[PDB]
mmCIF file of C-alpha atoms in Angstrom:
data_model
loop_
_atom_site.group_PDB
_atom_site.id
_atom_site.type_symbol
_atom_site.label_atom_id
_atom_site.label_comp_id
_atom_site.label_asym_id
_atom_site.label_seq_id
_atom_site.Cartn_x
_atom_site.Cartn_y
_atom_site.Cartn_z
ATOM 1 C CA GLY A 1 124.170 9.312 -18.821
ATOM 2 C CA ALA A 2 125.775 10.306 -22.138
ATOM 3 C CA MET A 3 128.965 8.273 -21.563
ATOM 4 C CA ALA A 4 131.058 10.689 -23.605
ATOM 5 C CA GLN A 5 134.652 9.903 -22.739
ATOM 6 C CA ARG A 6 136.763 13.007 -22.224
ATOM 7 C CA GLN A 7 139.103 11.310 -19.768
ATOM 8 C CA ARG A 8 141.569 10.429 -22.545
ATOM 9 C CA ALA A 9 142.226 14.132 -23.073
ATOM 10 C CA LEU A 10 142.296 14.634 -19.315
ATOM 11 C CA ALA A 11 145.147 12.116 -19.178
ATOM 12 C CA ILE A 12 147.037 14.671 -21.252
ATOM 13 C CA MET A 13 145.831 17.588 -19.128
ATOM 14 C CA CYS A 14 147.154 15.902 -15.973
ATOM 15 C CA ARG A 15 150.626 16.272 -17.462
ATOM 16 C CA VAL A 16 152.747 19.393 -17.670
ATOM 17 C CA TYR A 17 155.727 19.600 -20.010
ATOM 18 C CA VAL A 18 158.524 21.277 -18.080
ATOM 19 C CA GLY A 19 161.292 22.430 -20.372
ATOM 20 C CA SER A 20 164.856 23.515 -19.595
ATOM 21 C CA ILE A 21 164.517 23.288 -15.793
ATOM 22 C CA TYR A 22 168.191 23.679 -14.852
ATOM 23 C CA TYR A 23 171.256 21.457 -15.045
ATOM 24 C CA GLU A 24 171.113 20.402 -11.395
ATOM 25 C CA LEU A 25 167.585 19.694 -10.195
ATOM 26 C CA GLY A 26 166.898 16.008 -9.735
ATOM 27 C CA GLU A 27 163.741 13.913 -9.927
ATOM 28 C CA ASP A 28 163.007 13.854 -6.197
ATOM 29 C CA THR A 29 163.441 17.599 -5.700
ATOM 30 C CA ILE A 30 161.232 18.344 -8.712
ATOM 31 C CA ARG A 31 158.484 16.221 -7.161
ATOM 32 C CA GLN A 32 158.806 18.320 -4.006
ATOM 33 C CA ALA A 33 158.658 21.597 -5.942
ATOM 34 C CA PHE A 34 155.565 20.656 -7.964
ATOM 35 C CA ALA A 35 153.781 18.980 -5.041
ATOM 36 C CA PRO A 36 152.400 22.429 -3.884
ATOM 37 C CA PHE A 37 150.097 22.396 -6.914
ATOM 38 C CA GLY A 38 149.009 18.792 -6.642
ATOM 39 C CA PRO A 39 150.085 15.226 -5.759
ATOM 40 C CA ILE A 40 152.284 13.960 -8.570
ATOM 41 C CA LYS A 41 151.302 10.512 -9.802
ATOM 42 C CA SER A 42 154.107 9.979 -12.316
ATOM 43 C CA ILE A 43 157.235 11.808 -13.481
ATOM 44 C CA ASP A 44 159.187 11.230 -16.677
ATOM 45 C CA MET A 45 162.454 12.927 -15.817
ATOM 46 C CA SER A 46 165.424 13.505 -18.093
ATOM 47 C CA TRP A 47 168.598 12.016 -16.662
ATOM 48 C CA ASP A 48 171.891 11.386 -18.407
ATOM 49 C CA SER A 49 173.899 8.792 -16.518
ATOM 50 C CA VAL A 50 177.264 9.511 -18.167
ATOM 51 C CA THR A 51 177.361 13.248 -17.463
ATOM 52 C CA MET A 52 175.149 13.131 -14.347
ATOM 53 C CA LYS A 53 173.258 16.182 -15.595
ATOM 54 C CA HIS A 54 170.427 17.029 -17.984
ATOM 55 C CA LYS A 55 169.436 19.827 -20.340
ATOM 56 C CA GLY A 56 166.099 18.833 -21.805
ATOM 57 C CA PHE A 57 162.584 18.452 -20.459
ATOM 58 C CA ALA A 58 160.407 16.409 -18.120
ATOM 59 C CA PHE A 59 156.791 15.286 -17.895
ATOM 60 C CA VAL A 60 155.114 15.948 -14.568
ATOM 61 C CA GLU A 61 151.885 13.950 -14.411
ATOM 62 C CA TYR A 62 149.570 14.675 -11.489
ATOM 63 C CA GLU A 63 146.484 12.768 -10.392
ATOM 64 C CA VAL A 64 144.217 15.704 -11.235
ATOM 65 C CA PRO A 65 144.666 17.960 -14.309
ATOM 66 C CA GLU A 66 143.946 21.053 -12.217
ATOM 67 C CA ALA A 67 147.393 21.059 -10.555
ATOM 68 C CA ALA A 68 148.968 20.720 -13.980
ATOM 69 C CA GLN A 69 147.146 23.636 -15.550
ATOM 70 C CA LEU A 70 147.643 25.429 -12.230
ATOM 71 C CA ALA A 71 151.399 24.779 -12.098
ATOM 72 C CA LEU A 72 151.439 26.120 -15.649
ATOM 73 C CA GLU A 73 149.304 29.085 -14.609
ATOM 74 C CA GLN A 74 151.350 30.246 -11.624
ATOM 75 C CA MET A 75 154.802 28.761 -12.094
ATOM 76 C CA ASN A 76 155.578 29.685 -15.691
ATOM 77 C CA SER A 77 158.341 31.934 -14.411
ATOM 78 C CA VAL A 78 161.291 29.973 -12.993
ATOM 79 C CA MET A 79 162.214 26.766 -11.169
ATOM 80 C CA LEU A 80 165.219 27.242 -8.875
ATOM 81 C CA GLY A 81 168.805 28.043 -9.834
ATOM 82 C CA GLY A 82 167.895 30.790 -12.262
ATOM 83 C CA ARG A 83 166.122 29.685 -15.427
ATOM 84 C CA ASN A 84 162.914 30.823 -17.105
ATOM 85 C CA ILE A 85 161.197 27.459 -17.459
ATOM 86 C CA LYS A 86 158.606 26.372 -19.998
ATOM 87 C CA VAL A 87 155.489 24.736 -18.568
ATOM 88 C CA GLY A 88 153.424 22.943 -21.193
ATOM 89 C CA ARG A 89 153.210 23.339 -24.965
ATOM 90 C CA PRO A 90 149.463 23.855 -25.623
ATOM 91 C CA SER A 91 149.792 25.835 -28.852
ATOM 92 C CA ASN A 92 145.995 25.543 -29.383
ATOM 93 C CA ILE A 93 146.665 22.852 -32.006
ATOM 94 C CA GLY A 94 145.462 19.296 -31.559
ATOM 95 C CA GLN A 95 142.503 17.039 -30.864
ATOM 96 C CA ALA A 96 142.686 17.531 -27.105
ATOM 97 C CA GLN A 97 142.405 21.323 -27.389
ATOM 98 C CA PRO A 98 138.652 21.262 -28.372
ATOM 99 C CA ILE A 99 138.025 18.843 -25.494
ATOM 100 C CA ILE A 100 139.940 20.994 -23.008
ATOM 101 C CA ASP A 101 138.051 24.030 -24.277
ATOM 102 C CA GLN A 102 134.701 22.248 -23.940
ATOM 103 C CA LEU A 103 135.343 21.179 -20.362
ATOM 104 C CA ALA A 104 136.673 24.657 -19.661
ATOM 105 C CA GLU A 105 133.187 25.800 -20.613
ATOM 106 C CA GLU A 106 131.803 23.013 -18.422
ATOM 107 C CA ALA A 107 133.861 24.235 -15.462
ATOM 108 C CA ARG A 108 132.450 27.703 -16.138
ATOM 109 C CA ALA A 109 128.957 26.245 -15.786
ATOM 110 C CA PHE A 110 129.825 24.900 -12.337
ATOM 111 C CA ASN A 111 131.827 28.000 -11.340
ATOM 112 C CA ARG A 112 134.392 25.636 -9.837
ATOM 113 C CA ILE A 113 137.963 26.282 -8.672
ATOM 114 C CA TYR A 114 140.837 24.156 -7.348
ATOM 115 C CA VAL A 115 142.709 24.513 -4.053
ATOM 116 C CA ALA A 116 145.927 22.749 -3.109
ATOM 117 C CA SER A 117 148.212 22.622 -0.070
ATOM 118 C CA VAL A 118 144.984 22.304 1.882
ATOM 119 C CA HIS A 119 146.129 21.670 5.452
ATOM 120 C CA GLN A 120 145.636 18.031 6.452
ATOM 121 C CA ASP A 121 143.689 18.896 9.615
ATOM 122 C CA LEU A 122 141.250 21.286 7.918
ATOM 123 C CA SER A 123 138.110 19.554 6.662
ATOM 124 C CA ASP A 124 135.935 20.307 3.612
ATOM 125 C CA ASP A 125 133.534 22.525 5.538
ATOM 126 C CA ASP A 126 136.353 24.630 6.987
ATOM 127 C CA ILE A 127 137.792 25.379 3.567
ATOM 128 C CA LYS A 128 134.286 26.310 2.443
ATOM 129 C CA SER A 129 133.908 28.472 5.564
ATOM 130 C CA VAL A 130 136.889 30.731 4.801
ATOM 131 C CA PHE A 131 136.335 30.913 1.029
ATOM 132 C CA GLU A 132 132.682 31.706 1.770
ATOM 133 C CA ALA A 133 133.976 34.836 3.464
ATOM 134 C CA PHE A 134 135.047 36.180 0.064
ATOM 135 C CA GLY A 135 132.617 34.602 -2.364
ATOM 136 C CA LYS A 136 129.286 32.802 -2.384
ATOM 137 C CA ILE A 137 130.159 29.117 -2.331
ATOM 138 C CA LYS A 138 128.017 26.314 -3.627
ATOM 139 C CA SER A 139 129.977 23.200 -2.676
ATOM 140 C CA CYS A 140 133.204 21.972 -1.131
ATOM 141 C CA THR A 141 134.938 18.733 -2.044
ATOM 142 C CA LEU A 142 138.442 17.972 -0.840
ATOM 143 C CA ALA A 143 140.150 14.886 -2.205
ATOM 144 C CA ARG A 144 139.668 12.834 0.924
ATOM 145 C CA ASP A 145 140.682 9.205 1.232
ATOM 146 C CA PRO A 146 139.028 6.673 3.598
ATOM 147 C CA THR A 147 142.202 4.619 3.890
ATOM 148 C CA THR A 148 144.317 7.539 5.077
ATOM 149 C CA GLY A 149 142.013 8.843 7.782
ATOM 150 C CA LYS A 150 142.129 12.357 6.374
ATOM 151 C CA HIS A 151 142.180 14.248 3.098
ATOM 152 C CA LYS A 152 145.057 13.889 0.684
ATOM 153 C CA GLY A 153 146.012 17.562 0.846
ATOM 154 C CA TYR A 154 144.163 18.979 -2.133
ATOM 155 C CA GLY A 155 140.548 19.785 -2.876
ATOM 156 C CA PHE A 156 138.062 21.629 -5.030
ATOM 157 C CA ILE A 157 135.481 24.292 -4.331
ATOM 158 C CA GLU A 158 132.516 25.251 -6.419
ATOM 159 C CA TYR A 159 130.642 28.543 -6.367
ATOM 160 C CA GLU A 160 127.160 29.741 -7.256
ATOM 161 C CA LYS A 161 128.793 32.669 -9.033
ATOM 162 C CA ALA A 162 131.678 32.432 -11.506
ATOM 163 C CA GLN A 163 132.768 35.893 -10.386
ATOM 164 C CA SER A 164 132.917 35.027 -6.692
ATOM 165 C CA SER A 165 134.958 31.884 -7.313
ATOM 166 C CA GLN A 166 137.602 34.027 -9.030
ATOM 167 C CA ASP A 167 137.699 36.298 -5.984
ATOM 168 C CA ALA A 168 138.740 33.364 -3.850
ATOM 169 C CA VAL A 169 141.395 32.431 -6.425
ATOM 170 C CA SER A 170 142.985 35.852 -6.039
ATOM 171 C CA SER A 171 142.556 36.315 -2.277
ATOM 172 C CA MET A 172 143.165 32.773 -1.045
ATOM 173 C CA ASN A 173 146.176 32.116 -3.262
ATOM 174 C CA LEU A 174 149.245 31.639 -1.059
ATOM 175 C CA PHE A 175 147.058 32.171 1.997
ATOM 176 C CA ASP A 176 148.611 30.616 5.095
ATOM 177 C CA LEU A 177 145.835 28.553 6.634
ATOM 178 C CA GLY A 178 147.048 26.140 9.277
ATOM 179 C CA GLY A 179 150.711 26.597 8.471
ATOM 180 C CA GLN A 180 150.274 25.866 4.780
ATOM 181 C CA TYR A 181 149.949 28.106 1.722
ATOM 182 C CA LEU A 182 146.701 27.319 -0.074
ATOM 183 C CA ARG A 183 147.453 27.224 -3.794
ATOM 184 C CA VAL A 184 144.337 28.331 -5.627
ATOM 185 C CA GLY A 185 143.633 28.139 -9.324
ATOM 186 C CA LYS A 186 140.905 27.852 -11.920
ATOM 187 C CA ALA A 187 139.481 24.353 -12.292
ATOM 188 C CA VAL A 188 139.778 23.348 -15.944
ATOM 189 C CA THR A 189 137.395 20.408 -15.788
ATOM 190 C CA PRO A 190 134.521 19.538 -13.400
ATOM 191 C CA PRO A 191 135.766 16.822 -10.987
ATOM 192 C CA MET A 192 132.696 14.627 -10.589
ATOM 193 C CA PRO A 193 132.770 12.983 -7.124
ATOM 194 C CA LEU A 194 129.614 10.943 -7.706
ATOM 195 C CA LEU A 195 129.381 9.642 -11.261
ATOM 196 C CA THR A 196 125.990 8.062 -10.638
ATOM 197 C CA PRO A 197 123.645 8.944 -13.552
ATOM 198 C CA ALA A 198 120.739 7.021 -12.026
ATOM 199 C CA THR A 199 120.539 8.595 -8.589
#
């Protein structure tokens, strides 16, 4: 049971602070450019209505924190136009840091990774099948929704070996599987599909 709430810090981890961006990119296009990492649930975008441009920052909040840490991980280079963007400001100072670090350790215990841009037609087992070809997998769980008829486009995979899961991250990253580039990254917190502590 435990009932130790870490989800408050996760609500922070689901967000990525994107700084600078570029004086051009709008809210809708930014959603499209960050979607590769995960489905964006909310965006706080800087927009000045008198100049019709913006030089500031924006908060990209995904459903899962993985895509946020992941978008930070891979895309801390540029974001269109020609600007070195800043993703996140986790200067290892704060109350959330210890929590993030703890769950990081918890993700290590599960040997779990995150995969995005998972082609709509490919099911959990198929993603496991190909990743299994590189590392010894333990479990496959795509974010699948009963009221869509398919999976939402992102998922998570968990290995029996923390080494093997990192192999998949390197090999399967930007792998075209079904006409889509699987975005793979390290899972920062264990996504519990069945939170049933009495089963």
